[PDB]
Amino acid sequence: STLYEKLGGTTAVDLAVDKFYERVLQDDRIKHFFADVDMAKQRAHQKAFLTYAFGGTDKYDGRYMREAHKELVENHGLNGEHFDAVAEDLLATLKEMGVPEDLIAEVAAVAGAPAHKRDVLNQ
Numbered sequence: 269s270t271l272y273e274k275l276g277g278t279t280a281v282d283l284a285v286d287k288f289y290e291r292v293l294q295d296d297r298i299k300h301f302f303a304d305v306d307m308a309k310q311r312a313h314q315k316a317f318l319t320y321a322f323g324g325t326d327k328y329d330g331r332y333m334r335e336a337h338k339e340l341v342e343n344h345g346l347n348g349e350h351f352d353a354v355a356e357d358l359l360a361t362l363k364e365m366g367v368p369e370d371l372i373a374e375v376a377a378v379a380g381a382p383a384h385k386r387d388v389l390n391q
């Protein structure tokens with residue numbers, strides 16, 4: 269899988285997931301969501317988040333996605349502030365690696381698109 273070559277190696281890829289994983293638990297603001305959740309699923313969820321940010325989709329079909337995430341919005345009171353916290357954490361991880369600042373802005377723009385936030389937030 270030479271695709272990982274772009275990342276700069278597979279070792280670095282796992283390093284980001286491992287560190288990022290702890291950031292979620294470290295963040296008390298969203299820890300309640302992960303207070304009781306199977307770590308197995310989290311591995312995929314967190315992995316998808318990083319992958320989605322590096323290359324999200326302008327439009328995604330699937331009411332099911334909104335049905336679940338929206339449920340959190342009304343039941344747990346999830347808002348854009350929560351999303352920003354998770355996304356902000358990702359930016360910090362990139363800084364540690366030393367990725368040029370120019371890319372950090374572009375990377376955030378990928379998910380920054382409100383087109384993705386609406387599906388998740390379902391405002």
Ligand code: HEM
Pocket residue numbers: 298301309312313316317320336337340346350351354384388
């Ligand atoms: C764009 C970002 C996100 C994507 C792409 C995404 C994607 C997914 C996907 C594919 C699932 C189904 C498989 C699974 O259980 O992980 C899922 C489930 C879930 N997501 Fe997300 N998610 C995102 C953001 C969030 C955020 C911000 C929260 C809340 C902080 C969240 C909370 C949940 C919960 C609680 C479930 C479990 C639902 C259940 O099966 O009972 N997700 N997410």
